[PDB]
Design a protein around this nucleic acid. Structure first.
Lengths: 227, 215
RNA sequence: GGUAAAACAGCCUGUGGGUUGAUCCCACCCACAGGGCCCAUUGGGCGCUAGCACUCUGGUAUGAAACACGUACCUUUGUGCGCCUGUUUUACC
């Protein structure tokens, strides 16, 4: 589509720190529209954050961010902004920019949304994962089906990607949502179920990429040597 | 006083072709300034309905919205596979705006018992002083499942975390991983590590276990 | 009897008592008792399909537009004008 919103400026920030998000519009001019910010904590619902009205520049805020966040818009740059101060852990979320559409066409509905940008508020420092194998066994079978995987432990912040055999292996793969551990670091597993008879001849490699730390790990997952 | 939008149900299981109705009840007048959105995992929301009952351009006619006073409904007359998603209402009658809590619409199918697998910690991880024991519940339905960890037949509590995949696009099942975390010193105190799984598709709980250090 | 003018009273309904005329007798007043409808409610207002103006309270629609701005409206508060009834007057017939 020609109409696009692109959020940028997300990333890691310490509690009490500040971040400015940007929302760059393409295919339309924001000066004829209201622009809104909406956020979504991991696994939770949409939460409206702030908005700015055309021609007046009037601004509105959710009670949850009142006094800490400031929304603004630059007509010449065709870009909206969200200045966020005094950030707390509970502000961790994907932040979306959204266009309120044209009144005659879609009322007050928000007709275009950006892809969103992740903001993580934590005292933890960026850290790449340790990748450990989840080895298969012949004693651990569901019929003629074995399971194996990779445990992707102690990384920060989100996200990580996992593929198998450089994307050649997709069937039967389950890569689980990360959990935030009490240490403040994330962990996830990625598994695949394969034929038991394949275990001796077929090779399995999980490819783990953690862009925030510029970390890439390839881990071969093999049956234990005694097996 | 901020306007509340109380959305129900929080989750719905329906078969392809079923009619579903999602309700959003405002705590004050919002006139007809209510919008409905669809959102799929990892994706931005998409507008469906604006002004409580108007279909947004390009949205299929099987979606409809209605207002009765301060109660609002979204109806899908016949679910198609691409319609299984989360749905949100929104009031934009006054500031601050309010989204409803969401309704996740998931695919109903026949019961499927999980395939269960238990993974000892790797020797590599152990060298660093921590043991992660992983239990996999593969391709089951419905989502509700109970995992219990036992260590030499002692029930564990508080030292495990789990997560669940989104419903599989091909077979409509779920999978679940549970991770039990121990210090290496604590791990070496015990022999039998067991994952006990309860699920509607199992007539009695299934236990998968290993003896620490066995092949 | 009527005509005209400036006033006074009227949310709705009682129950007493007074007023001031000998009695009477309504009008006014007073007290009390209720019963509605509305508003911006520690309180305030309501004679009116006879409404109008401005002003506020809260709203609608629209201009690429929730506020602000422009346009066209609705509503409420207050004020003034108008109107109805009842009664008392003054000028006139």
């Amino acid at each position: 589509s020609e109409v696009q919103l692109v959020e940028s400026g997300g990333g890691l920030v310490q509690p009490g720190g500040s971040l400015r998000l940007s929302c760059a519009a393409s295919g339309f001019y924001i000066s004829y529209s209201s622009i809104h910010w909406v956020r979504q904590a991991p696994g939770k619902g949409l939460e409206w954050v702030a908005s700015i009205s055309p021609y007046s520049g009037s601004t509105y805020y959710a009670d949850s961010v009142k006094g800490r966040f400031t929304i603004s818009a630059d007509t010449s740059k065709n870009t909206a902004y969200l200045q966020m101060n005094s950030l707390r852990a509970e502000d961790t979320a994907v932040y979306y920019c959204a266009r309120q559409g044209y009144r005659r066409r879609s009322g007050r509905g928000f007709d275009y949304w950006g892809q969103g940008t992740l903001v993580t508020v934590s005292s933890a420092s960026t850290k790449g994962p340790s990748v450990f194998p989840l080895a298969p066994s012949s004693k651990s079978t569901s019929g003629g089906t074995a399971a194996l995987g990779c445990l992707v432990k102690d990384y920060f912040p989100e996200p990580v990607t996992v593929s198998w055999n450089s994307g050649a292996l997709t069937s039967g793969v389950h890569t689980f949502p990360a959990v935030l551990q009490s240490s403040g670091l994330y962990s996830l597993s990625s598994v695949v179920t394969v034929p038991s008879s394949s275990l001796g001849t077929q090779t399995y490699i999980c490819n783990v990429n953690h862009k925030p730390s510029n970390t890439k790990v390839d881990k071969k997952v093999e049956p234990k040597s005694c097996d | 006083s901020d306007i509340q939008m109380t959305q129900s149900p929080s989750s719905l299981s329906a078969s392809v072709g079923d009619r579903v109705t999602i309700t959003c009840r405002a705590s004050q007048s919002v006139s007809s300034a209510v919008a409905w959105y669809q959102q799929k995992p990892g994706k931005a929301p998409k507008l469906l309905i604006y002004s409580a009952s108007s279909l947004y351009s390009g949205v299929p006619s099987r979606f409809s919205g209605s207002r009765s006073g301060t109660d609002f409904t979204l109806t899908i007359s016949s679910l198609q596979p691409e319609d299984f998603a989360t749905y949100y209402c929104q009031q934009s009658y006054s500031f601050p705006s309010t989204f409803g809590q969401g309704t996740k619409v998931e695919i109903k199918r026949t019961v499927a018992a999980p395939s269960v697998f238990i993974f000892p910690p790797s020797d590599e991880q152990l060298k660093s002083g921590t043991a992660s024991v992983v239990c996999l519940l593969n391709n089951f339905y419905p989502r509700e499942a109970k995992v219990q960890w036992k260590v030499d037949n002692a029930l564990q509590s508080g030292n495990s975390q789990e997560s669940v995949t989104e419903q599989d696009s091909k077979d409509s099942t779920y999978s679940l991983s549970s991770t039990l975390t121990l210090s290496k010193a604590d791990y070496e105190k015990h022999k039998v590590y067991a994952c006990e799984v309860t699920h509607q598709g199992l007539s009695s709980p299934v236990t998968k276990s290993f003896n620490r250090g066995e092949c």
